[PDB]
């Protein structure tokens, strides 16, 4: 849970800045595409492209992530099968790396993976 890591995270996200929400949704979308079967657990929600629920839940996962960044006290910061959270994170990475191909060096990437794999855990360790 390295300190170097900590520097990479703040940096990367700060670069994201004004696009957290957009990226939140985009991530969810990649999940539903790269992990089709993920949709299955959801038949009472709009999972269509541009759904408002997804746009809403993207903003949620973003804002959340931002906080979880300030307090890097995440389990002091803050049903649904766990795997969704594990996979969301994965896509979240992909999304970031695709929008910031410059900022994401094989290291910053790994440093984020770890970071998201924890936020992932503090959620489903719940």
């Amino acid at each position: 849970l390295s300190p170097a890591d900590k520097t990479n995270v703040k940096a990367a996200w700060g670069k994201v800045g004004a696009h957290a929400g957009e990226y939140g949704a985009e991530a969810l979308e990649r999940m539903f595409l790269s992990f089709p079967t993920t949709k299955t657990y959801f038949p009472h929600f709009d999972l269509s492209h541009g759904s408002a629920q997804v746009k809403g839940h993207g903003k949620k996962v973003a804002d959340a992530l931002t906080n979880a960044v300030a307090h890097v006290d995440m389990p002091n910061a803050l049903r649904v099968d766990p795997v969704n959270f594990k996979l969301l994170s994965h896509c979240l990475l992909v999304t970031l790396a695709a929008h910031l191909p410059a900022e994401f060096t094989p290291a910053v990437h790994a440093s984020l993976d770890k970071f998201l794999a924890s936020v992932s855990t503090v959620l489903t360790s719940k």
């Binding site: 290291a107 990437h109 992932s120």
Partner: protein, 89 residues
Amino acid sequence: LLKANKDLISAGLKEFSVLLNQQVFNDALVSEEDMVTVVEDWMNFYINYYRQQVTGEPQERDKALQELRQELNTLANPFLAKYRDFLKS
């Protein structure tokens, strides 16, 4: 071959594998099918970054991302057999 490149690969293969290692099979409850997709998403990222760093001529460059893409393969396959058999434990 061309050194700059050759080295860039060594640097990669390591950084990649550092990532593989930072993966705790328990903490991340995922599927065989899914994991394959994930390592897939990972190497693509690597071939993307390193392609940005690779240097020079085409016959020499794109050729490099060949090895880079293979040596990554060669690393992932094992890591996959692990998780394969890990899930089945």
